Amino acid sequence: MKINRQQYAESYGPTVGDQVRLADTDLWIEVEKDYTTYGDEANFGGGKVLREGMGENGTYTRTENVLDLLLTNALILDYTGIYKADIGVKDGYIVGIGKGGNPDIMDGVTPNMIVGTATEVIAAEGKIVTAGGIDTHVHFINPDQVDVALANGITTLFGGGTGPAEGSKATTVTPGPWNIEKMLKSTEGLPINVGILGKGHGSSIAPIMEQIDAGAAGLKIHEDWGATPASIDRSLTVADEADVQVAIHSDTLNEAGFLEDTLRAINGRVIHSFHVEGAGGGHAPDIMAMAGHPNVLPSSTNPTRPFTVNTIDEHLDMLMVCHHLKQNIPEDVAFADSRIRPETIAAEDILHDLGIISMMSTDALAMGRAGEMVLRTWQTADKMKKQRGPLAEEKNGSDNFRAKRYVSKYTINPAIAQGIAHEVGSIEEGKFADLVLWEPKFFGVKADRVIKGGIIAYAQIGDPSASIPTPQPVMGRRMYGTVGDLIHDTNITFMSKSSIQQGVPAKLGLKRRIGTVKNCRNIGKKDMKWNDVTTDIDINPETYEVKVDGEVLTCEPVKELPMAQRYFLF
Amino acid sequence: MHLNPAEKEKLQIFLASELALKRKARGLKLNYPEAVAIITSFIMEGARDGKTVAMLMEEGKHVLTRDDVMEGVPEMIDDIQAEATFPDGTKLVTVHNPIS
Amino acid sequence: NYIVPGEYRVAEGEIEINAGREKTTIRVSNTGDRPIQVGSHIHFVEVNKELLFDRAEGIGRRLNIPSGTAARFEPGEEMEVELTELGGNREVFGISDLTNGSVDNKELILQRAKELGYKGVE
Ligand code: NI
Ligand code: NI
Ligand SMILES: [O-]
């Protein structure tokens, strides 16, 4: 019979044409299409449809297309689009996007999504489901930061470091075979996908290759170790021979050469740039031109994003503290002026808005906060929507295009950059099961349910002593997927092809699923989704002005922003 | 003292409640987490006093008014449920739309 | 300009369930004592014995009510209900173990029904 839209949305979820607002921001997502058919919606509970002899099948065994887990009536939002559908995962792999139910009594059920006796049901009605966020700048300094990362729907930490060490604090590297083997062995206890980056400096091919053959997944070229052009050349040779990605922390003192010298040293190859904006480091002041090349993949760290009325002072103070800068020497003042430059941040706002920068990262505990990458990404999105207004591709008064572009910056684009695209990074069949379920009113603050490999790993859950799970205090707790030996099965540890073939996991006794990094040196800025624009970036050496397409880019810092004290205790 | 983990967990609720009370007494508008803390702490204290479940539910809706909290917070909380040791055992107290 | 997170602004229109299918209306009476709840997608011949209706028509059909919702029958209370077809493969198994196969062989279903004492068989 006739059903009013409001009741249907309240009981099942939004339909075609409905708009949902992401937290306190001013962003509305409109459901483009829908795969389920009205009247055949599947839900669980007492007296519901999913029962033996009903929309739940009861004859087929596990092998005959019977699923192992299904999220019902979820609202998928990925670079492929935004639509409401049902998610079906089996053996820890996403196997079906569509509608789930018994084809015996329902119509239009996708053949691979048969639900039977050996299935689990999770009701994601009125919840936003996103792929696990990918972090590319993590300084491994504290083992309790994995929980903070998990609280924001981050399932892949890609970095180096051996704890509270001097080099580990300064740079994200894992120098040598011994240290990288120790880190790989210690990786067993972390309930997260992990990738390890080794030191990418030296004067010979063999010492650099020894790290890749030991189990490294990439290379980092940090300034404090010495970013000489010879080191860049050696690292690039090792990389394209071994098919791994290289991350560059460009020189800031210009002691070994200007930006053009490094640009010639890379020689038109494919490289990944860390903190391309330049607050965290880089060639003062024209580093940001790397955002314009058609062969360099850009990125950004969080503490500068977005532009508020307090970034400059805190950044100056942390530069004062970490590097032991003093106010009795004017060289430190000159360094601060030449590093922290507000015009470049005001430009980076628009370049993030315009799709010039394709990714976004954290640089955890290294002038960057681990647990607010998605938070700050969506804050920047809302601020840019408020200031620069609607984009040119908007239709019917909806923000689908902006949402897709900004959600591509921390889920899929880093996966393309690091070469791990074919296992993780998006909701797509054949990929691993790393999903994050948010409530619409909490989207971007606290992940409601983080599931890795088909088993729920993290959840905002209440007191354990109550008869029901909701009663206060609700807090983030690790579920059964991060205890016992189950942690070894729901996690993927990424590893180079050459070091995988050498039986490194067997020698080390690795037990987690081993991931292979491939298809990394064949890509560029032309392959990123919605963020594939390359142009000329002009940096004025004196006025520090930024000009793009013959136009100056700047924006005014805001005093108040959403995604803020309304949610956090402090 | 002999504390099961439950008491150690509710002590955090009490701490958040007293912090929220200090913030409110200063003259600020509360946001969602500490408003939840105040409501649940009032529920727990009223249960410890010796009130019944029905009267606790009734007075749970008249502790915070909608102009003591941040803008739009009243829509955060559909209901609040808590575990409280009444004079005749532990019980679950649930109050719907506590702020209006 | 009141702000509410997660709020929806639904469009104008109405959602129809079970589009393009034949609709029937029957009379159901409960002759028992305990109240009976009946789901939406549950097949309508394998329903409780004490239900009284035209069981012959209620073969290969289900309740035309929104999914997850249920119909309630008080003791000695009768009401009119709406039924629609069961689409897809039209094979049904299990439940009360009366059909255990296709729905086109109504003779076997009715024979088993009157053998086991199901009320309303005709
Ligand atoms: Ni760096
Ligand atoms: Ni770093
Ligand atoms: O960094």
CATH (domain of A359):
3.20.20.140
The whole domain housing B26 covers 2-100
A366 within ligand 3 shell (Cβ under 6 A): yes
Query: What span, in angstroms and rounded, lies between the C-alpha atoms of A352 and A88?
Result: 34
Q: What are phi and psi of A495, to 5 degrees?
A: -160, 145
The helix-helix angle for A373-388 and A342-353 (nearest 10°) equals 90
- Tell if the CB–CB gap between C4 and B72 is shorter than 8 Å: yes
A443, A464, A483: which is the final residue of a domain? A483
Look up tokens 């500490």; give the residue.
B34
Residues A27 and A159 in one domain: no
Experimental technique of record: cryo-EM
A336 has binding-site annotation: no
- What are the residues whose beta carbons fall under 8 Å from the beta carbon of B24, sequence distance 6 or more? B30, B38, B68
Q: How many structural domains is chain B composed of?
A: 1
Test mutation, C7, C41, C80, chain A, max A CBs within 10 A: C41
Q: Does any CB of chain B come closer than 8 Å to the CB of residue A473?
A: yes
- Tell if the CB–CB gap between B73 and A566 is shorter than 8 Å: yes
Ligand nearest the Cα atom of residue A227:
1
Six-digit token pair at C52? 């009284």
DSSP state of C96: T
Question: Checking DSSP bridges between strand A69-78 and strand C14-16, what pairing results, if any?
Answer: unpaired
- CA nearest to C38 within chain A: A47
CA-based nearest distance A472→chain B, Å = 6
Helix H or strand E encompassing A312 = helix A311-322
- What are the residues whose beta carbons fall under 8 Å from the beta carbon of B11, sequence distance 6 or more? none
What is the distance in angstroms between the CA of the first residue and the CA of the last residue of chain A?
A: 49
Query: What span, in angstroms and rounded, lies between the C-alpha atoms of A41 and A49?
Result: 9
Query: What span, in angstroms and rounded, lies between the C-alpha atoms of C12 and A444?
Result: 29
Q: How many residues does chain C have?
A: 122
Closest CA to A276 of A473, A116, A136: A136
Query: What span, in angstroms and rounded, lies between the C-alpha atoms of A341 and A253?
Result: 16
A86 within ligand 3 shell (Cβ under 6 A): no
- Amino acid identity for residue A437 in this structure: L
A60 to A22, A102, A116, C41: CA distances (angstroms):
41, 11, 7, 20
Q: How many structural domains is chain C composed of?
A: 1
Cα angle at A281 between A158 and A518, to 5 degrees? Answer: 30
Six-digit token pair at C107? 């003779």
Say if residue A505 is preceded by a cis peptide, omega within 30 of 0: no
CB C21 within 8 A of CB C84: yes
| Other residues' Cβ atoms within 10 Å of the Cβ of residue A48 | 21
Give the burial class of A428: count Cβ atoms within 10 A of its Cβ; 0-12 exposed, 13-18 middle, 19 or more buried: middle
- Tell if the CB–CB gap between A473 and B9 is shorter than 8 Å: yes
Q: What are phi and psi of C107, to 5 degrees?
A: -60, -45
The residue ranges of DSSP E strands in A147-231, in sequence order, are 154-160, 193-199, 218-221
**What CATH code is carried by the domain that includes residue B70?**
3.30.280.10
**What CATH code is carried by the domain that includes residue C16?**
2.10.150.10
Query: What span, in angstroms and rounded, lies between the C-alpha atoms of B64 and A54?
Result: 47
A483, A504, A525: which is the final residue of a domain? A483
> Measured in angstroms, how far is the CA atom of residue A281 from the centroid of ligand 3?
7
Task: Name which residue sits closest to atom 1 of ligand 3, judged by CA.
Answer: A363
Look up tokens 């839900």; give the residue.
A43
A468, A483, A498: which is the final residue of a domain? A483
HSE at residue A531, side-chain half, CA atoms within 13 A, is: 33
Q: Which chains touch B (3 or more CB pairs under 8 A)?
A: A, C
Test mutation, C2, C10, C90, chain A, max A CBs within 10 A: C10
A90 to A96, A273, A320, A430, A511: CA distances (angstroms):
9, 37, 52, 10, 21
Closest CA to A563 of A404, A373, A309: A373
Query: What span, in angstroms and rounded, lies between the C-alpha atoms of A454 and A69?
Result: 7
Ligand nearest the Cα atom of residue A159:
2
Question: Checking DSSP bridges between strand A271-273 and strand A93-98, what pairing results, if any?
Answer: unpaired
CA-based nearest distance A477→chain B, Å = 13
**DSSP sequence for A252-276:** SS-SS--HHHHHHHHTT--EEESST
The whole domain housing A543 covers 132-425+484-570
Six-digit token pair at A355? 């799709």
- What are the residues whose beta carbons fall under 8 Å from the beta carbon of A443, sequence distance 6 or more? A22, A23, A128, A378, C5, C6
In the residue annotation, A283 being an active-site residue is answered as no
CB A42 within 8 A of CB A100: yes
Closest CA to A472 of B29, B16, C4: B16
Residues A271 and A179 in one domain: yes
A283 has binding-site annotation: no
DSSP state of A287: G
A161 within ligand 3 shell (Cβ under 6 A): no
CB A441 within 8 A of CB C5: yes
A352 has binding-site annotation: no
Q: How many structural domains is chain A composed of?
A: 2
* Residues whose Cβ atom is located within 5 A of ion ligand 2: A 172, 363, 366
CA A367 from chain center: how many Å? 18
CB A109 within 8 A of CB C88: yes
The whole domain housing C50 covers 1-122
Closest CA to A306 of A405, A359, A375: A375
Closest CA to B44 of B93, B87, B88: B93
**Sign of the torsion angle spanned by Cα atoms A262, A265, A267, A269:** negative
| Other residues' Cβ atoms within 10 Å of the Cβ of residue A342 | 16
